Amino acid sequence: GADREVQRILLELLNQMDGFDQNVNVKVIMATNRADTLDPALLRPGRLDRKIEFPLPDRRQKRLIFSTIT
Amino acid sequence: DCTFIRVSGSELVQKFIGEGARMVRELFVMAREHAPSIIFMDEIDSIGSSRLEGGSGGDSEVQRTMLELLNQLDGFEATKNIKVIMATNRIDILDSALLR
Amino acid sequence: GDLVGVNKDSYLILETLPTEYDSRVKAMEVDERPTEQYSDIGGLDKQIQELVEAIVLPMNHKEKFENLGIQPPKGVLMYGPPGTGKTLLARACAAQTKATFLKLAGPQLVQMFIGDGAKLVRDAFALAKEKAPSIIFIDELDAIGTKRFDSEKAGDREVQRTMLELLNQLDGFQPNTQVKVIAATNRVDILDPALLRSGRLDRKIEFPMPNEEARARIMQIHSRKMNVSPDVNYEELARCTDDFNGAQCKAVCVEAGMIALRRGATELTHEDYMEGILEVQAKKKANLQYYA
Amino acid sequence: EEERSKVDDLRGTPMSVGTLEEIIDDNHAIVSTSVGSEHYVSILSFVDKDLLEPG
Amino acid sequence: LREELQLLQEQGSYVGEVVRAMDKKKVLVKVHPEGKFVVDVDKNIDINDVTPNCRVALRNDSYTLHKILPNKVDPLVSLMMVEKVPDSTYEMIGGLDKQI
Amino acid sequence: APPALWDLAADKQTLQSEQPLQVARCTKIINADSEDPKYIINVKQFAKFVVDLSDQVAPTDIEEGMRVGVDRNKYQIHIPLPPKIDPTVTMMQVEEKPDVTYSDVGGCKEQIEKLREVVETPLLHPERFVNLGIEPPKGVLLFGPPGTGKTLCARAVANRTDACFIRVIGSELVQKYVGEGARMVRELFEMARTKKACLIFFDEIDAIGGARFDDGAGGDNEVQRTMLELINQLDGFDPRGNIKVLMATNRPDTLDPALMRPGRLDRKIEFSLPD
Amino acid sequence: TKQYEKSENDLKALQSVGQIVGEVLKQLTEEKFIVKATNGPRYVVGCRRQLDKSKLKPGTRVALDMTTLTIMRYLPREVDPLVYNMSHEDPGNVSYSEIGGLSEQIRELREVIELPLTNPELFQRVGIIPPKGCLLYGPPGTGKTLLARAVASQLDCNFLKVVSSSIVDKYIGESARLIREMFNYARDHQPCIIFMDEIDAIGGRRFSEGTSADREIQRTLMELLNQMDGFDTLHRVKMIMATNRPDTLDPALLRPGRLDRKIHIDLPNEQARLDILKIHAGPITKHGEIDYEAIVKLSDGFNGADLRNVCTEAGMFAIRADHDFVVQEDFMKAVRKVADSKKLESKLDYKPV
Ligand SMILES: Nc1ncnc2c1ncn2[C@@H]1O[C@H](COP(=O)(O)OP(=O)(O)O)[C@@H](O)[C@H]1O
Numbered sequence A: 001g002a003d004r005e006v007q008r009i010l011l012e013l014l015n016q017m018d019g020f021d022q023n024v025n026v027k028v029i030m031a032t033n034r035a036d037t038l039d040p041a042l043l044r045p046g047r048l049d050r051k052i053e054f055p056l057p058d059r060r061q062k063r064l065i066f067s068t069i070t
Numbered sequence B: 001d002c003t004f005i006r007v008s009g010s011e012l013v014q015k016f017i018g019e020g021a022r023m024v025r026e027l028f029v030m031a032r033e034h035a036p037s038i039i040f041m042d043e044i045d046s047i048g049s050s051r052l053e054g055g056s057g058g059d060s061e062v063q064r065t066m067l068e069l070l071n072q073l074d075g076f077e078a079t080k081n082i083k084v085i086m087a088t089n090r091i092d093i094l095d096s097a098l099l100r
Numbered sequence C: 001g002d003l004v005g006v007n008k009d010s011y012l013i014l015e016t017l018p019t020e021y022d023s024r025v026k027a028m029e030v031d032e033r034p035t036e037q038y039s040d041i042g043g044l045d046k047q048i049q050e051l052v053e054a055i056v057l058p059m060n061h062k063e064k065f066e067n068l069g070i071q072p073p074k075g076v077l078m079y080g081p082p083g084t085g086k087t088l089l090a091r092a093c094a095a096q097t098k099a100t101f102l103k104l105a106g107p108q109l110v111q112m113f114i115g116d117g118a119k120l121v122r123d124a125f126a127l128a129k130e131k132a133p134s135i136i137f138i139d140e141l142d143a144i145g146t147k148r149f150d151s152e153k154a155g156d157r158e159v160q161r162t163m164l165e166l167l168n169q170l171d172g173f174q175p176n177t178q179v180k181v182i183a184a185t186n187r188v189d190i191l192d193p194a195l196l197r198s199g200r201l202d203r204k205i206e207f208p209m210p211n212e213e214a215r216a217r218i219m220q221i222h223s224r225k226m227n228v229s230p231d232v233n234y235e236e237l238a239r240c241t242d243d244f245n246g247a248q249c250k251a252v253c254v255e256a257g258m259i260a261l262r263r264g265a266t267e268l269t270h271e272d273y274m275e276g277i278l279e280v281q282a283k284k285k286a287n288l289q290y291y292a
Numbered sequence D: 001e002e003e004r005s006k007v008d009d010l011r012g013t014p015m016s017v018g019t020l021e022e023i024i025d026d027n028h029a030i031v032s033t034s035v036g037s038e039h040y041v042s043i044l045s046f047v048d049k050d051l052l053e054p055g
Numbered sequence E: 001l002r003e004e005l006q007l008l009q010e011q012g013s014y015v016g017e018v019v020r021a022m023d024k025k026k027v028l029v030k031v032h033p034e035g036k037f038v039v040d041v042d043k044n045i046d047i048n049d050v051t052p053n054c055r056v057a058l059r060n061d062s063y064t065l066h067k068i069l070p071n072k073v074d075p076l077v078s079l080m081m082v083e084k085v086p087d088s089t090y091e092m093i094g095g096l097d098k099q100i
Numbered sequence F: 001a002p003p004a005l006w007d008l009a010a011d012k013q014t015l016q017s018e019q020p021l022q023v024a025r026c027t028k029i030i031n032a033d034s035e036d037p038k039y040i041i042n043v044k045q046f047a048k049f050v051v052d053l054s055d056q057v058a059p060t061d062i063e064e065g066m067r068v069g070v071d072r073n074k075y076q077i078h079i080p081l082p083p084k085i086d087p088t089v090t091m092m093q094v095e096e097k098p099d100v101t102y103s104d105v106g107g108c109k110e111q112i113e114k115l116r117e118v119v120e121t122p123l124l125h126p127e128r129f130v131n132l133g134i135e136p137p138k139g140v141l142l143f144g145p146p147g148t149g150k151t152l153c154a155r156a157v158a159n160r161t162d163a164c165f166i167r168v169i170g171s172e173l174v175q176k177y178v179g180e181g182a183r184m185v186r187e188l189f190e191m192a193r194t195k196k197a198c199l200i201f202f203d204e205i206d207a208i209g210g211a212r213f214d215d216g217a218g219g220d221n222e223v224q225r226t227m228l229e230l231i232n233q234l235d236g237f238d239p240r241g242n243i244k245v246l247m248a249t250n251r252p253d254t255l256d257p258a259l260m261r262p263g264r265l266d267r268k269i270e271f272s273l274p275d
Numbered sequence G: 001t002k003q004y005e006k007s008e009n010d011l012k013a014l015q016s017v018g019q020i021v022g023e024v025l026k027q028l029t030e031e032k033f034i035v036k037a038t039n040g041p042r043y044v045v046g047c048r049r050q051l052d053k054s055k056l057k058p059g060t061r062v063a064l065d066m067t068t069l070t071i072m073r074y075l076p077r078e079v080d081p082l083v084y085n086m087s088h089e090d091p092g093n094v095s096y097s098e099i100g101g102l103s104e105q106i107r108e109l110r111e112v113i114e115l116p117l118t119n120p121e122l123f124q125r126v127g128i129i130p131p132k133g134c135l136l137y138g139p140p141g142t143g144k145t146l147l148a149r150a151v152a153s154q155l156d157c158n159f160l161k162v163v164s165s166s167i168v169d170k171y172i173g174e175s176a177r178l179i180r181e182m183f184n185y186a187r188d189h190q191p192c193i194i195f196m197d198e199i200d201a202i203g204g205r206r207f208s209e210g211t212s213a214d215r216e217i218q219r220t221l222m223e224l225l226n227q228m229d230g231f232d233t234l235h236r237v238k239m240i241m242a243t244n245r246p247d248t249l250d251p252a253l254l255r256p257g258r259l260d261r262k263i264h265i266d267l268p269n270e271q272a273r274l275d276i277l278k279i280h281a282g283p284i285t286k287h288g289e290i291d292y293e294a295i296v297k298l299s300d301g302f303n304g305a306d307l308r309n310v311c312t313e314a315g316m317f318a319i320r321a322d323h324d325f326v327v328q329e330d331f332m333k334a335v336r337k338v339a340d341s342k343k344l345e346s347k348l349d350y351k352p353v
């Protein structure tokens, strides 16, 4: 219930972070290794509108990761 | 201008109203405070939630969330101004015919 | 440390009073001892004759190892389905240990909150090494036996670390050397199999169905409390005893004595005895027919 | 009549909300209420001392 | 200022929520960080002026109720609702002329 | 109102008797006593104190880890209170009053009598086992159709001649928050020992006694406790249980208490059943 | 008589009440400094007249008066658990040679740990980043815990063992902070070394999430990641990890960084078991008749402790006859027959990598 309150705090920070609109200032940048339990209101329109995933390194990136280390 | 309501709802809109129950009655009590009201199923429009079993029971109460409400709208209680909305593509649309 | 005497706003420490904690977490079970001795029960002798060493040789015969530089056995296990009778026997050996005994069991390893059982075992071996020499014997190891393997999830998977710390105290830590600990289960079926070592469990003694040696003697020592019309085969049962547990034989003389009760009889006879054999087991009534 | 203007001072000024828990069979009722505060009440009025009941 | 600066320490002050009122004139109110109380009138605002589930100022001395304030329940619900989706209107939508 | 009028009268004597013993809060368990004058007591308010007594309390009459009364100013020892746990789920599980006596039997004679000689026949005369005893047996086994289960308990309800015994409902044993009912089955027996031999009966013992196991993943693990935990409650030397036991079920499984009952219990009998 | 009065005059200093601990958070003016009690109320008070704020700084453990709450005295660093994780001692050192096998397990871990300490130049000579940790696993064979325990008192320098049990901390399992609280002195006492047994049960998957006690687990993992995910350089600490299996840890740990290298144990070879019996046969003296390969050729596919303990158990089984010295005869029987019973539960010991 305290954590429920800290996820109400997550809700309370969900609440009062939209006061950034508009202008100054924030960059909300997010990372997770598992997308399972992320709530819909966390991905809410106006919260996460842009998704970056992990592209796997490949022949370019390999030859880049081959050259950059050595 | 009729007020708008959705379905679950995570995680923490549940016990925030009441303590524990079938939990749909308190939502049915919400519409008694404000009428006309609009209730909605958010979302369960997808082909991915099926699983053919594991998503059934997860959808079954999402399906039941309309059923027991339809049973608490038409079956008994009262009166007008309350509505529900569904969305899907296929599969459960044919499973809607199981309910329909 | 703990318990430093201070009163309110004074905030000064007058004395440090020993020790530790807490209630029944402190003492799981502190008893005098079992009220009878193992010399009454027999037929399992030679294997418990091996077991009583593990408690007695650190109690006394460690001097034998001082010659050649050996260390006493720590891990030991006791198992088999009831009965057997370890429940009486595993305690019955504590009368000859003479050191203070502590009863651990699966329900103790059932934990409301987390870290207690760990802290308990941290404290249990505190109070062990503190009261060393002492005796500790545990039970229902199979309750915490398996960690599952893959998540998700087990509650005892955290409390397995209490056993892993019990291992870490018997493997990664020296101080567990004293206060030899024994374990028991109804079955050894599935647990952490890595437990094989002297630090963790070592002695594995399979207790089979009691045989006609014990089977004749067990109830004989269970019925020595009561009178007997002085002819009883004791082979009759012992020959016809199949799958009969040592505890069932205790109840064989009961219902045999129960009809002797409602017969108004002064003493128990074999015709009353042998009826109690098939009276307690097995099953039926069903019908007797087409053979008669 | 006068009892209403008498025990209102004993009640007064406010009164809390407890949680009825257990009873000493002498009718001294041990309660756990926030935070876990007990008491012993054998009081004569409004009870119905029995049926108020644990829990 | 000093008098209210003298008044307010020996007691404090708080804000309550009425969950019920009594025939004896008392009122069921919680001390929210702690367990609930039940306290009386409070002769300025009567019982019928306020209904259960409303914000009042918990008094700090007789532990009575000082003033009256509005309380919110649906603004938490409707915000959780309005979190999800906006509305727009006919003019801002198209292609649904068949189904509207 | 004449009840209510006399009801508000003696609050004077209640407020005069209020000042003494009123501060007896808080119910507190002790920890250790090093020597004569000293004690250390521990409460659930988080308050832990090493503190003395009120002179009305003798040292040898008190037990370690004992809920006591205290005046939290001096932090004295007022009086120890025996009870500890458990809340009304006990008082729901614990039951009283009679009804449904023998004569409701549907004609079964020695099917009920073989189990009538096990329970109330020794309870009629516990002296009966002075001369001949030996023992009143350990446990029983019951199962079959519904007819007639738990009415033989109701038969024992009306015909109980001593103290009101305790029914046990199955699905309240299985609980969230691992180990909830684990405390209960353990602690309720002392609450039954508080009633000094007053009998107990378990219902749905097949569901709660679940046996045996699958590889993974439990699930049954936390419940694998309760069965063997009851077997520990069975493996407790004392009494056991001075209440004997009476157990009704449906299927032969669960096997572990059914293979533990030859290790402890006795008297496997059966419905009755139609004839 | 005079010393007793000195203790009385000692007590004449003790009526003065002890101050309240504090953490200076930040400051506002020379009379106002942001401070909080350990129970959460935040205050702004004045200092004493001896100090300069250079002796305070924001984010500083301090003390305040009991009434005025004024800033008076202070200490920068304190904690309970740190030093009390240090005191476990392993005989040897020479236990290095007393683990028997195995060379590339023995020798490589020296190059993995020791040389990083003494000569980081040899890392920058080639240009390779220093490994900041190590990983064991098993249990084919065994010795993951002792080889650690041995190297601790062997490698010497500074090392601090992490007891894996008590972290759960009952109420409020936030104690992942304590790893930083431990890492803070690991950044203070640096260099220092850390062994960790059982990272797997604190390696919870949250695969299919359930109940409650898993949530506190996974949260305690997030810091362990971020502590190694810095924003910081832990290189002067050496994190050593071993447990039942290297499986459930989830891929976040399984990558380098968090798991720097792959080291493990298998069933020791009978050639290496020939040496494992010497360190068993060393402390035991008997009649001089020995064939080491006899037990090695008879007793097969065992572990160091499994051999030793049963080999000592054989001596204990043979001394049951009350005779003192025992030839391998009983041991070619006991260790043979006894371990046969011990190999009955050798079942299902083969675990994924
Ligand atoms: N010869 C005997 N004398 C007394 N009790 C016996 C005998 N044989 C079996 N028992 C009974 O068998 C029961 C359980 O046997 P066992 O399987 O050894 O216990 P556990 O598996 O719980 O350690 C004991 O409670 C004991 O009373």
Ligand SMILES: Nc1ncnc2c1ncn2[C@@H]1O[C@H](COP(=O)(O)OP(=O)(O)O)[C@@H](O)[C@H]1O
Binding pocket: F104, F105, F106, F107, F108, F145, F146, F147, F148, F149, F150, F151
């Ligand atoms: N011999 C009998 N005497 C009295 N009632 C009987 C008898 N046999 C069957 N019954 C009836 O059968 C029913 C048993 O149902 P129930 O209590 O559900 O059994 P269980 O508790 O075993 O599930 C009772 O209503 C009871 O009246």
Ligand SMILES: Nc1ncnc2c1ncn2[C@@H]1O[C@H](COP(=O)(O)OP(=O)(O)O)[C@@H](O)[C@H]1O
Binding pocket: C171, C172, C194, C195, C196, C197, G098, G099, G100, G138, G139, G141, G142, G143, G144, G145, G146, G147, G276, G303, G304, G305, G306, G308
């Ligand atoms: N030669 C040996 N002598 C004694 N103990 C040994 C020997 N070799 C390995 N071990 C034991 O193996 C332990 C580590 O293995 P571990 O995986 O914890 O055991 P298990 O394989 O039984 O789970 C060490 O703590 C050590 O006590």
Ligand SMILES: Nc1ncnc2c1ncn2[C@@H]1O[C@H](COP(=O)(O)OP(=O)(O)O)[C@@H](O)[C@H]1O
Binding pocket: G225, G228, G229, G230, G252, G255, G256, G257, G258
């Ligand atoms: N240039 C890089 N590209 C990809 N991975 C890297 C690079 N440098 C380090 N890493 C790896 O990333 C890990 C730390 O990454 P970080 O993003 O903090 O972890 P996480 O993604 O779990 O929070 C280190 O263990 C390291 O092995």
